[model samples]
Structure formats: structure tokens, C-alpha cells
Target: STGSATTTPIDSLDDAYITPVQIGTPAQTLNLDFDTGSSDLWVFSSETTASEVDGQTIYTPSKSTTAKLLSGATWSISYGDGSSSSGDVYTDTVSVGGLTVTGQAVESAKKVSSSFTEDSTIDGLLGLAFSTLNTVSPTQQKTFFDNAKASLDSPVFTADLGYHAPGTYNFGFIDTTAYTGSITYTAVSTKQGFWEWTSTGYAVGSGTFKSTSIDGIADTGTTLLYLPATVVSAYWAQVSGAKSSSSVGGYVFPCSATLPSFTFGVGSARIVIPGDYIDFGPISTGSSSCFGGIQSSAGIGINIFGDVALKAAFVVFNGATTPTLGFASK
Candidate 1:
């Protein structure tokens, strides 16, 4: 994960889900999670006397040189994943790496689950997603990115998940050094709040797209890649000895064989996903072996190129400025 002269300190797993920011010097570093799904940076504080909020890594203002409470501002957040956290508002000097921004809007959680209190890697989260997703503002809740976009090195920010685990994400800059050639570009759709594009079809080995054809949508919120059943079935057909293990939820081919590399063509652009990334693992319901590349979404009506596809490509989230998706090296 080391590139150029910059040794990017990869954030821990908690950082993937929760971005931790340092308020003062290295001696007073405050860990927090960065979440884009919602707008607002929230953390547990020493003032939280709620029993449910006990034992969590609470941010003690005494530990930092500059910290201020928002006084009466109250807040709450519930995630799409069915988890929730609530707290008050506060203003603090936030710094990540060498970049420091003052008066950054943040939340202080007073009531939290033991799940959030048990781990101590990070103390809170700093959201860098879209401002429209913010929870602090009722009329116009702006995300940290919305406010900090003007100060970033590049108008674009790239998430390098290959370094950390499933949610190991990054923000604020793009590494041009990773690209072997010129970066690929896709005009963004401002209305979607995410970088999106249409897929022409999929390929097995050198085969062309099936008549049925499949479209693809890239989403960071999702963890697994989901494809149409017809596309999945057509793909499995190309594997000579490949058999569907219903238990795995997808096709589990012999791991030792020379599985052909697959490509997902979008317009004139083609994204190749290696074989190992195709077969994810075993399924719990039907005991079918799940092919990481594709799986049934019960006809959800769209193909989601999740973190798997992102891990293989350099993704540029362009919602902060103009609408555009810029692809560079991994």
C-alpha cells in the first residue's frame, strides 16, 4: 500500500466504518470513523453519563489543547445497516495527517450500544460524504466533504480498500502515481449523488455479451457484487468442470484450475475482474458456492458492482464538485 514518498498511514478497521481525527499534536490524537452514508462527524464524550454509553472510547476535552462543546445542539443517527447512535453537537479542531481544519462540526454521543463502546481503536467518526446526507442541519445539513472540498489537494478523492479490510476506505486525495496510463473519465450524474454508468454487457473468457445483455451500477454502500441470474448462469456455462454448489450461493469452480479472466464491458471501456475475486465463498441458505463476481439479487433489477469491483479499480468519487467519475490506477 506504500506509494511515492508519502507513506499513507492506513487507518484501522474501525477507521473504515468510523473516521478518527486528531485534534492536537501526535500526543493528543483522537481516533474517529469517517462515514459518508450520512453527513456529520460524531463521537462519544466524557460528559455522557448514560449507562448505555459507558465503556466506549469517549473523547475527553482535557486530553486536547482545543475542544469546545456546541452547548445545546442535540443529534441522532440511524444507519441503513439497522444500527443507531445519538448524541449532542460540538465544534473542534480536526486534523487528519498534516491537514487541519478548525471549527469542524461534530457530534458527541451520549447514549450508545455496547457494540460501539467495547472497541477502543477509535473514539468517533468524521463523515466525508455528501452534505445532503448530513444529520446536524435540518434545512441544509452539509457533509464534511461539502465544507472541506475547497481545501483538498485534488477536486477528486480516491478510496484504496486493498490495504485494509472490507471497509478500509480513504479520502481527500488521488494518487496519480498509481496509474500506468492516462486516467479514464465518466461524466457524473449530479442527481444520483454517486458516480454511475451503464454497462454494455459481460464477458466469459473472450466471449461476447449475451443477447439478454446486462447493465452494471457501481455502489460503495454495498459490500457484495450482484448480477442478473441469466448473466450468472451464462458465465457458469463457460467453466468446463465448474459445478454449482447450491450451498455456496454461487458457482465454486476448482480453485486450482486455470480459470479464465472475466471482463465487464461498459461502452468502449472494459473492466476485467480476476477469477479468484469471482467465487466469493459458501452460501448459508442453499449451501451453494457463491461466485464472487456475480450472484442473484432476486431480480433486484440492477447490477451492483460493489467493493469487489472498486478494489480492482481506482474509483474517484466526484460528488463534491462537478459531476464526473475519474478512474485512475489501483
Candidate 2:
């Protein structure tokens, strides 16, 4: 069987993509971020600290007949921003788009940090990464995608993220019409429990290609594209008034600067990110300088191809035992 769901950016900055999901009997609908960067299907729920959940929707398992608490099981995960949430676990009927999982493990947040509470756009996170990264204790749970893949007509899922419009996530089968040109297939290294892949090289705007292998994760959870320091420097050097600021952190340039496009290769295929995509809005409201959507990953030591890059292509997450990733321009 196959299922599909529509996802939309919560705001104009394209901070994150939120997809609707159904949880429990009778189905309580909540919009969640389908994150490919982590594996933990957690939610804001009745179990959460009352003061902690501001404007977010809270899942009430007690109201669902299909809900079953997993005794003693708990989970906690920290984000790159240093914020974290932790809570107990539950198994209940969960549906994404049209796909159903009878015993999907749902981590119910009992405590959440400030950052999560501030973001009312997402009620929770539906992780699409490998199940091995699940944080549930006693027994690590499989992600919704992993649990449902077995019954799918085909073991694959694809993401068509949009710049400022709505996108779609398809499970089981590929939507041939969603993309143009032939798909470019590449190997994925699930060794790190992420949809990690290697890019052959990159070019700043239309400049000559730098023939160097760059390994990175295609993470939907992250908001920016992170590359090596060298690559970031080269790209910014082309801009007349660009500099790395220590106070604000990372690269920033004149808001009026004509930012150049960025190009990265997946095998022999090249995907070019439009110049405007890198011009992340002003550092502060009404500020003259704009923060860059692409930054250096040197300090973190892990390169990430986030929404800035993902939206530029149609991506397929092939869930076969020998996992592979497919990329195509739409």
C-alpha cells in the first residue's frame, strides 16, 4: 500500500515544514515536523508539564481507546540548539497521510525546554531517520516510516520540499510526475543513523567546480545548509560586503547584495540552489545586513544539507536493507 501527505512551511522564512498526522483512536489531528535528522516520534501531550505547553496542540492518550502506555519506558533527546525534552512512552494507532501503524511508539513529552515551547507551529516531531537512533529506553522504537515500510507496496519514501509553498511526502511509491529529468541515485551511509550522503564537488555560482568529496547529512530538521569552512569562505568572497561576524555568529552580508547561487553534485548530476535562497532574511527586524542560509560546518565537524538544499531537489529515501538516496530536480 502507499500513502502521501502534504507539508507546508510554517512561515515565510521557511523555518520548517509541518505535516498533519493522526494519532490515537478517533484520530486526534496534530501538525508535526517530519524530521529526517533524528529518530524519535515525540509529541506535546497530556503528559507534558502544563506550564510548558503554550500554544501547541497536546495529544491526550487518555482519550484514545487504542492508546497503551509502555510501562517504565522513557525518552529524552537534545537538539543542536541545546534545548531538550523528555518523557514517557506510549503505543497507539498512528496515521500519516493515509498510512496506518497500529502500535506506533509515541513518546509523550512531560517536560520541554523554552525553544520548543516558543515554536507553536509544530505539535511534535515524526522522525523519518533510522530507528536505531530512537531515544526510547528499555526498547528503542522503530520510526513510523520504518514500522510502516514493511506493509508498503515498495520500501521507499520521497520528499518534495518547496521554497515557500506546500510540498508532499510520499510513502511506498515514487510520484514520477513530481520531478523532471531522470532521478540521480546515490549511496547512503546509515552508519551515523542519518540519511548521510557524499557530494562529488561544489561550485560557487557558475564558477569552476571544486573537485573534492564532501560528506553530509540530508537533514530536514536543520534550518540551514552547513559546509566546510573553505567552501563557505569561497562563496562569501564573491559578495562585495560579506563577513563572518563573531557577535551575531556565522556569515552575514548586505541585504541588498546580489547573492550568488550554490551548486553541488550528486554523482554526475548537479543541483543549483538559486541565489535568493541563500539570502536569509535580515539579522534583525529592519536590519540592513542579512544572515546567510549557508554557513561553515567546520566547528561542528558535521556537514549538513538542510532545507536550503533539500528544497532545491526532489529527494527519495529508499528504505530497502541496502538504503539508497535519489535526487531529482522538480
Kindly give the number of clashing pairs for every candidate: 32, 1
Candidate 2 lDDT (Cα, 0 to 1): 0.93
Candidate 1 residue spans exceeding 4 A from truth: 1-20, 24-37, 44-57, 111-125, 137-140, 163-173, 204-206, 209-221, 227-262, 278-304
Q: In candidate 2, what are the lDDT values of residues 14-81, reduced to their tens digit?
A: 98999999999989999999999999999999989998998999999999999999999999999776
- For candidate 1, lDDT tens digit of each residue in 194-282? 34465556677778754334545555444556777766677777776676556654556644445565676544566676666565443
Model 2 lDDT at residue 208: 96
Candidate lDDT values, in order:
0.56, 0.93
What local lDDT score does residue 302 receive in model 2, on the 0 to 100 scale?
92
Worst ten-residue run, lDDT, model 1? 1-10
